[PDB]
Design a protein around this ligand. Sequence first.
Ligand SMILES: Nc1ncnc2c1ncn2[C@@H]1O[C@H](COP(=O)(O)OP(=O)(O)OP(=O)(O)O)[C@@H](O)[C@H]1O
Ligand SMILES: [Mg+2]
Lengths: 50, 48, 49
Amino acid sequence: SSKSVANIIRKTIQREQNRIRMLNQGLQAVSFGQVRGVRLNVNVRESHAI
Amino acid sequence: RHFDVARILVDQAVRLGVAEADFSGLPAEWLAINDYGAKVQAHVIDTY
Amino acid sequence: IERGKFRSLTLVNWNGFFARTFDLDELVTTLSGGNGAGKSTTMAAFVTA
Ligand SMILES: Nc1ncnc2c1ncn2[C@@H]1O[C@H](COP(=O)(O)OP(=O)(O)OP(=O)(O)O)[C@@H](O)[C@H]1O
Ligand SMILES: [Mg+2]
């Protein structure tokens, strides 16, 4: 059961990472003050990968 | 109208290069620019 | 009588301010500039001092 759990979480995380990374390109270097672009960083947490 | 002029001019002038003296640590003076008591503090704009 | 006054404020080697002095007005001093110009940074310098 534990193995299966870990597996499904891994799959879900990968799918969502991919979806968000694809979405990121929906932004076109907005200009706000010294801010030149906005982005979302998605990364699995090694503390959780362990 | 003088004030509404000064402002605009400065807005146009500060986009054109910088003033090199500003890195010298020597403060600039308040030069009078008309009668009635108007003053300005800015170093000369040298580096375009 | 004759209230003391803050005359000037000096910033040294800050982000965007290597060396900048402002002459404090006796009544009102008005900073003006675009977003991120660093006005909040100036008031910060004051209060920290
Ligand atoms: N601690 C900090 N670390 C990194 N950048 C900073 C820091 N504090 C300010 N900045 C940047 O310095 C610049 C000045 O910010 P600041 O908010 O003072 O500007 P401003 O034009 O006065 O705007 P505001 O009206 O929001 O105060 C901006 O780019 C801000 O992102
Ligand atoms: Mg600010």
